[PDB]
Symmetry: C2
Subunit: 86 residues, 2 copies
Amino acid sequence: ISIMSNNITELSFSPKCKNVTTLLMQNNPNLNKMSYGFFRTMSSLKVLDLSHTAITSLPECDALVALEHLNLSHTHIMRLPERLWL
Amino acid sequence: ISIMSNNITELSFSPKCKNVTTLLMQNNPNLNKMSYGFFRTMSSLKVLDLSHTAITSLPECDALVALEHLNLSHTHIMRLPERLWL
């Protein structure tokens, strides 16, 4: 999945992405609201890029069992959820 | 499940309550933090009581497909989540 450089403002649904292994969202300057429980079906997600985006908080991601890359550079994230440590 | 009139302060874990049909937490004066996804396994919770408790927010409830009673009296909930309307 790749929606880079889009003007996305709201990401409110919860996708059925069981097979997704790569997700990019670089250069979304207005995307700041994300649905809690967005990553429930993303167990196989390996690359996640919320870079250059306007989110201040990230949905909990205990279901991201296989994630290996996670970039949040140039974003307004103020605290990183405790689920990441597991 | 009934833990009413207790001095519970934190409810963070997500239980495995598949068969549960009742949750009672009346008169918990200090319980104010509840982790999101707490009601994930409550696919059959029919009665849910958070009364005389100190919560100001409620976890996501998309999995409450069969809930028929929900009491939140005497609690500091300031806004009610949009997932309730479905």
